[PDB]
Design a protein around this nucleic acid. Structure first.
Ligand code: MG
Ligand code: MG
Ligand code: MG
Ligand code: MG
Length: 127
RNA sequence: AUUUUGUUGGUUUCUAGGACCAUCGUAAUGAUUAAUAGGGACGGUCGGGGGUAUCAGUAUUCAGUUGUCAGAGGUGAAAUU
């Protein structure tokens, strides 16, 4: 039917990555971050910047031949937060409303089997 | 060693007295409970109890291959980077 890439979306709390590869992931087709759409550091991870990022990502994809994508959402993971950033849901919604068709959706947040020590110290970050 | 042989050492037997040893006979012959104390044995277990090895798991960081291209990071907001 359609020709699938894989939209590997990394939505942290400081930025939002929209990166579409082939199925293998060794070939990158389009990579637009929320920081290429705004000039303020404070909203690099905003839903607005992620939606704009997906439209440019979506815009670049049609001219290469990608008509549909699979979604691999991840949060920062590791020792840091496992919840996705605010930009991951809007960039995903933008892709569906941009004419790209969506296949499988998966969370690929890296999750440790206990892991190494987390930054911040014993008492946490005191504010 | 108490006696008394007129005496004093006598003298060693005698006589008596403990103290043991054997035989025999008497006897209902002789060992308190097993603590809702404890200790110990034993039987199926049960535990993230301990020690020594051994095998996972993803993650983190660093590096090699790739791939694209302008930002990335981080914060309440930034800057150092
Ligand atoms: Mg406080
Ligand atoms: Mg008893
Ligand atoms: Mg049983
Ligand atoms: Mg050992």
């Amino acid at each position: 039917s359609q020709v699938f890439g894989v939209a590997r979306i990394f939505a942290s709390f400081n930025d939002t990555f929209v990166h579409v590869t082939d199925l293998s992931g060794k070939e990158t087709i389009a990579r637009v971050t929320g920081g290429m759409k705004v000039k303020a550091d404070r909203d690099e991870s905003s839903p607005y910047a992620a939606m704009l990022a997906a439209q440019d990502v979506a815009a670049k994809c049609k001219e290469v031949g990608i008509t549909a994508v699979h979604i691999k959402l991840r949060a920062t993971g590791g020792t840091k937060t496992k919840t996705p950033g605010p930009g991951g849901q809007s960039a995903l919604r933008a892709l569906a409303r941009s004419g790209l068709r969506i296949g499988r959706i998966e969370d690929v947040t890296p999750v440790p089997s206990d892991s190494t020590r987390r930054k911040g110290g014993r008492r946490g970050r005191r504010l």
